Amino acid sequence: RLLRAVIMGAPGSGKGTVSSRITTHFELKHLSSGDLLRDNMLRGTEIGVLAKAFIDQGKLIPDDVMTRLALHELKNLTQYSWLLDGFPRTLPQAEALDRAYQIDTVINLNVPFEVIKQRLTARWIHPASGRVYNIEFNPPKTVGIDDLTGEPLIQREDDKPETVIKRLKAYEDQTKPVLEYYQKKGVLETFSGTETNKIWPYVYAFLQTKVPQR
Ligand X SMILES: Nc1ncnc2c1ncn2[C@@H]1O[C@H](COP(=O)(O)OP(=O)(O)OP(=O)(O)OP(=O)(O)OP(=O)(O)OC[C@H]2O[C@@H](n3cnc4c(N)ncnc43)[C@H](O)[C@@H]2O)[C@@H](O)[C@H]1O
Q: Which residues are catalytic?
A: 15, 89, 123, 156, 167
Cα–Cα distance, 59 to 198 (Å, whole number): 34
Q: Residue 11 or 127: which CB sits closer to Mg ion?
A: 11
- How far is Cα 87 from Cα 189, in angstroms, rounded to an integer? 17
Separation CA 66–CA 48 (nearest Å): 11
Contact between 134 and Cl ion by CB under 5 A: the answer reads yes
| Residue 123 marked in a binding site | yes
From the CB of 114, what's the least distance to Na ion, in Å? 25
Q: Cα dihedral angle (60, 66, 69, 70), rounded to 10 degrees?
A: 110
Residue 47 binding result from ligand X, Mg ion, Cl ion, none, given CB thresholds of 5 to 8 Å by partner type: none
DSSP 191: E
Q: Does 55 bind ligand X (CB under 6 A)?
A: yes
186 assigned ligand-binding residue: no
| Beta strand 4-8 pairing with 82-85 | parallel
Annotated binding-site members: 12, 14-17, 33, 38, 59, 86, 89, 93, 123, 133-134, 156, 167, 196
Q: Name the residues that contact ligand X, by CB under 6 A.
A: 11-12, 14-17, 32-34, 37, 55, 60-61, 66, 86-87, 89, 93, 119-120, 196
